[PDB]
Give the backbone structure.
Amino acid sequence: EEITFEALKKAIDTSGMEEQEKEKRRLVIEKFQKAPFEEIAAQCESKANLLHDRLAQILELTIR
Amino acid sequence: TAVPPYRLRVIAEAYATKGLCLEKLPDREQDVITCYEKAGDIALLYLQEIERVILSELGFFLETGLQRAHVLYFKNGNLTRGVGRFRELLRAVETRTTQNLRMTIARQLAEILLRGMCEQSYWNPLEDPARVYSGENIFCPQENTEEALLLLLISESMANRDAVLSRIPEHKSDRLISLQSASVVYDLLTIALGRRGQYEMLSECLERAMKFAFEEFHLWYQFALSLMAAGKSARAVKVLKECIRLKPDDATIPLLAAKLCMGSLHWLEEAEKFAKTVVDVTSEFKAKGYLALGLTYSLQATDASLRGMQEVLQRKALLAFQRAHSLSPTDHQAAFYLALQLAISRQIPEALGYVRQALQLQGDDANSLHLLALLLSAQKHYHDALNIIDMALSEYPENFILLFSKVKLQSLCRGPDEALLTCKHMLQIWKSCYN
Amino acid sequence: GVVEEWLSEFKLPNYATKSSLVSSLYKVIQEPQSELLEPVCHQLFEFYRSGEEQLLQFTLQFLPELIWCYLAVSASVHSSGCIEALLLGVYNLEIVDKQGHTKVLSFTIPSLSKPSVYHEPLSKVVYSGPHPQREMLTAQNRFEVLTFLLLCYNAALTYMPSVSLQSLCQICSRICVCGYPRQHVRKYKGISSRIPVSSGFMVQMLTGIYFAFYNGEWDLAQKALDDIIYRAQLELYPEPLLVANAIKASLP
């Protein structure tokens, strides 16, 4: 595709994005206060494991 | 009513004598403390009424019979009663004869009011946990900080008046006492004001107390350190020089002076002089001095105008960096800066090894990842550099230089569409981060 | 395993008011080699939804030990990653969950020229907030929320026992010296790494440690202050050095 100068001219101008923060807060609340807690431990353990994996990957890519 | 005051004075003295006698014989202690409280109240009435009569000199029993009761409370642990007694003492009408007692009680209240309670254990003076100043236009205290700051302000305002002006003709006791009082009150003020982060007011207050300072290291050092936090530079540099003159034994002061010289003020000769002074005098301080001297030499190299002195400054800087690294092998900043300086001479493998060692020391540095990514550009390995830039952006999704490097690298490897996408993302980020 | 019987009998407002429950919790949490860490941890989190204070204050004193243990073990090893969930939850409930609005802490500056209650001859200043809510932990915003939770913990200093202050100062001792030769003089053994601390963190650290001097603990506070001032002098941080120097010259 292509990108036009009007795209940037409308990106700089505000588009009225002061209303979705309410539903963002509501979804954060629905994810924390009432969502199940058992899978949170599993997903954060997986996140830590993938962080370790990518750290090892970059460490082994540094030498090469 | 219509009672001569000397009768109140003598009955208060009798109350104090009985209270002294009541305890010295084998509950009733509460009655004795109540007698002390009523003696203090009648003494306050006596002093206020005698002052009123005089306006139309030996305070001996009020202070004892009142303070020592809540001193016994402190020995027992009745903090609330003592706080209430102090509040009712301070809220009373001022007395010119007991201004020193007002000073003392205010200082005692301020000393304990910052290190003896919590936020939820605070109450306004107008509710429970002779003439009294009142009205609706007065400033009602709200929190501990407000009233503590007000008490410190009034104590400082009155304590400046009673200064002996550091007379030192032949006697020194009075000046020493005044200096100790000023030091403690200003220390309380600065410790109270530091926790909230209003440094301009603190700097102004410290500057207000510079009349007493003639040959004092502490006040000058405190003022100099307070000046730097606010943002002012030239006055900070001058006071740092004066402090260096005062006591030439430490190394932190010239290091801070050199840092300020190297910073936004953009001066060079003074930084070199301070670095040489530091290196003239454990091992960490001299390593830091060597690093600062090398940084100054490297900075002078960029702003040159001819050929030879550039190489001379570069070789001096690399020698200084090598010496600093040799003197201390357990700091990643020195290794990173040595790798950065070495890369200027286009010697690639040695700089790569040094930056690898620096990453081994610390693998989360922002600038180290950028340097590693930029090093691969000279070796013509574009995808790996792109991946490193991607990892760095994952760490810092709010930086600017890394994304500029990302745009530059994308424009050379994949195509312009990704560059346009990154540019519009950066525009959106800039709009989000500002108003 | 008294906590096991406690959870068996638990899963009404007078549940709290135990003599040795705090000791048992310290015993189980002092090491990461436990098995009921996640159930008991989400149970500790389950004490926070209720609005009463005798529960939040009863459960709030355990934060520094777990923070040190997890943020030092991770900076080395298996990582649970679920303590960050509780930290983010308490941060969210203290930044947003009051009534629907956020928190804007502010106060006034008294003016001497204006007659007051105690004497006769103010603009709002915000020191914290608003803080946008966090969802994950990274190396860019972790110290901010850590400092915010430390500030939250530093608002009810009276209630916690002396053991909490002892643990706090013990953590404060070796955290800022863990990666320097100075700790080798003090004979500390464990992880030989370093943590890139921030200025506000140590400012709140000094604010917290200043209270411990007049509550029995004397030598530990003094050595912690010496370590803090040494680290600040090595790192060239003006404000912590100023605070430490001010505290030094006010001891009888």
Observations:
- Residues 38-63 of chain A form the longest helix (26 residues).
- Helices of chain A lie at 5-12, 20-32, 38-63.
